[PDB]
Design a protein around this nucleic acid. Structure first.
Lengths: 83, 99, 56, 68
DNA sequence: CCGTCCCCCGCGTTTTAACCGCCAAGGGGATTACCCCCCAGTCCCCAGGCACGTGCCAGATATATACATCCCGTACGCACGCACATCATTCGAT
DNA sequence: ACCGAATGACATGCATGCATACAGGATGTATATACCTGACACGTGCCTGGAGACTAGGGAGTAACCCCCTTGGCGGTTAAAACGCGGGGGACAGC
């Protein structure tokens, strides 16, 4: 019973865990939805660029360095994976 | 005997006026004196080119205005009408300059 | 075009920066490109928060 | 890994994904989410509450400027 | 300050679906070879654009006047409770 | 238990609170008008730099091959997700 949108594959407890790491004590139920949408929004930008470098290089395979380059564009550099 | 506007009744009027208008608001003379005062520490007897000074004025007000409008929202988010310094700290915190 | 249009819509035929700011901030598509920069004598868009409105 | 493959299919078709590139998205998204979380508390505590509600996460994403 | 609830929380089931471990295929990313065709390099050049002047215009700029609007008072309704007499109940006499 | 005196309930008189609509009247704003000229718009140089035509030699674009690492699949366990719920304290409204 897994055939659906994979966004719901992000289980509610997984969110509950992340709020803890950010130090959030108490969470209302309505948070679980926009967090999905907000996170959803975040992917849209990064992959679009990530796709762009790959197809510009004519490559059909998304490689690791393509990720950091796009992440660098949004003002969030990523140490640890190349460059 | 003389008419009095209700509290805040006047205040909203300047809001409408000033956003329509697009001129500077700081007194011209003191601002040029202040920048001279602060800049004195980094370097002695520097000469400010006349056109350069108002640029600092223009950016400052633009930077300043952005602060208050942002600090305004959280006050509403706090169900308040009047801003107090704790809001600005929060706003400066979230953008990431104070911290 | 937007600036020249709007200034004409304000009964004025000479383009000035106050007109120029209005066009950029009113179109979100351009607002993305020019969200960072502010323009000299730009002036703020006319806006008032709803809660600030009079109680009646 | 399913989720990234699903969304990426919209932008283009037949994208084989390098395994190393995968875990990056989590870490980048995780910290972004984590960072987006902590400041929300400051917005929440500011209104003297203890529980966060989505109207705050919207407010917080505005002050950063990303909401617009 | 007060209060007020409900709606998140811990906690107990229990389902499963990740997670593992293994097996396989081949697409394709990575690497080499060939090269031609493509952009940099020179020389000449010539007209586009820039520096300077110039005024005219309208853009402005100022005038006076009409209009739009806000606040307070005013009035006025009204539905009200308080106050009141009256209606109805109660203690004493019958 | 009905008749009086007395008194509580019932019914309304009285006064008031409160709301509301207005009209005023004041003020600010928009209109409505002339003059004004700093100031855009040409306009005229004047040259330099962009275009034309030239050769030269390397970097991009091809084919070509390969192998690995991506993708696929394929059971087994079991940790984690899903669910129920009891309740209390956090939100929140009001003074």
């Amino acid at each position: 019973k897994v055939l659906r949108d994979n966004i719901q594959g992000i289980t509610k407890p997984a969110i509950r865990r992340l709020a803890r790491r950010g130090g959030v004590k108490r969470i209302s139920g309505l948070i679980y939805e926009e967090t999905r949408g907000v996170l959803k929004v975040f992917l849209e930008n990064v992959i679009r660029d990530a796709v762009t470098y790959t197809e510009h290089a004519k490559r059909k395979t998304v490689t690791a360095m393509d990720v950091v380059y796009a992440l660098k564009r949004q003002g969030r550099t990523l140490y640890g994976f190349g460059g | 005997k003389p008419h009095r506007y209700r509290p805040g009744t006047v205040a909203l009027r300047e809001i409408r006026r000033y956003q329509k208008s697009t001129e500077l608001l700081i007194r011209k003379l003191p601002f040029q004196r202040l920048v001279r005062e602060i800049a004195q520490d980094f370097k002695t007897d520097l000469r400010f080119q006349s056109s350069a000074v108002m640029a600092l004025q223009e950016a400052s007000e633009a930077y300043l205005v952005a602060l208050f409008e942002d600090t305004n929202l959280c006050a509403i988010h706090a169900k308040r009408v009047t801003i107090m310094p704790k809001d600005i700290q929060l706003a400066r915190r979230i953008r990431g300059e104070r911290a | 075009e937007l600036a020249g249009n709007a200034a004409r819509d304000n009964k004025k035929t000479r383009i000035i920066p106050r007109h120029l700011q209005l066009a950029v901030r009113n179109d979100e598509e351009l607002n993305k490109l020019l969200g960072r920069v502010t323009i000299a004598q730009g002036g703020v868009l006319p806006n008032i928060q709803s809660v600030l409105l009079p109680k009646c």
